[PDB]
Structure 1
Amino acid sequence: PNFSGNWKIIRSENFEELLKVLGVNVMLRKIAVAAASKYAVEIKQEGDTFYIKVSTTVYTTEINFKVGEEFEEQTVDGRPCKSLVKWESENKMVCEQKLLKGEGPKTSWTKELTNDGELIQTMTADDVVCTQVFVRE
């Protein structure tokens, strides 16, 4: 019932298939699946404004946004995009993305707090949904 905290991953389903849809070649997909076993997420939320840092062993990115306000980030496979985040319920946000340049699959992500105390992130590329479960550090 509050997104802020330090989260560490405990499940990661369908990641490889998502990267396949995004054109990642086989060997890098496998290395990305290994690296995704160390996903850590740090969230600072205040009202409807968010700072979010997603890190692995060697790579870290920080996102900053307000619900309803377009902002710029990168897709899972690194292509820049304009993103817009909306609420779907008390503890779930959905983000639609659109590419700055070129084209490719429609991408989107979600974040959700379960009442069991988990953080659930999904990432979608066309018809493929990757699901990732996190618990408080």
Structure 2
Amino acid sequence: GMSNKFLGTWKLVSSENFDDYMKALGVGLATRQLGNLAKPTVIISKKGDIITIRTESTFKNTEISFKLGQEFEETTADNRKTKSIVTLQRGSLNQVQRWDGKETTIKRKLVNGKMVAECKMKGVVCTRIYEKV
């Protein structure tokens, strides 16, 4: 299953192209302004086979709980209502969100002890790097 090295608290230290990613999602200017200023913490936990990813920031908190390979209903930070799934590929924790005929992917992988989240939509690629705290 998911490597236990994902478990714990992560803090955003680098974000590239998040504004264009949010634009591709349909997020408006004022929300993007706050989104680009946010430096969230991400807490990854498990209980049995249920994995939880909680995102905390002054602007917005989100939490998803899921079993690998089982579709679930998600309410994203920008209030999209998506059908989502998380699965593993070579140790990468890969999330897909589908709504209104659209799709975005968030792939979270460990690289030299950091957590790297690659966010993709409509040819837009955003990379967010987290330090373990």
- Confirm or deny a common fold (TM above 0.5): yes
Question: What CA distance in whole angstroms lies between the structure 2 residues aligned with 1:42 and 1:88?
Answer: 21
- Shift in Å, 1:32: 1.6
In the alignment, structure 1 segments of 5+ residues that lack a partner are: none
- Shift in Å, 1:76: 5.2
1:13 is the counterpart of 2:9: no
1:111 is the counterpart of 2:126: no
Question: What CA distance in whole angstroms lies between the structure 2 residues aligned with 1:94 and 1:12?
Answer: 18
Question: What CA distance in whole angstroms lies between the structure 1 residues aligned with 2:96 and 2:7?
Answer: 22
Q: Which moved more, 1:23-32 or 1:118-127?
A: 23-32
Aligned 8 A contact 2:34 2:59 in 1? no
TM-score (norm 1): 0.84
Q: Paired residue for 1:77?
A: 78
Letter in 1 for 2:94: V
| Structure 2 CA distance for partners of 1:59 and 1:31, relative to 1, 3 Å | closer
**What do you get for the CA RMSD once the two structures are aligned?**
1.9
Question: What CA distance in whole angstroms lies between the structure 1 residues aligned with 2:18 and 2:101?
Answer: 18
Question: What CA distance in whole angstroms lies between the structure 1 residues aligned with 2:27 and 2:43?
Answer: 26
| Structure 2 CA distance for partners of 1:60 and 1:28, relative to 1, 3 Å | closer
Aligned 8 A contact 1:75 1:107 in 2? no
Q: Which moved more, 1:72-81 or 1:2-11?
A: 72-81
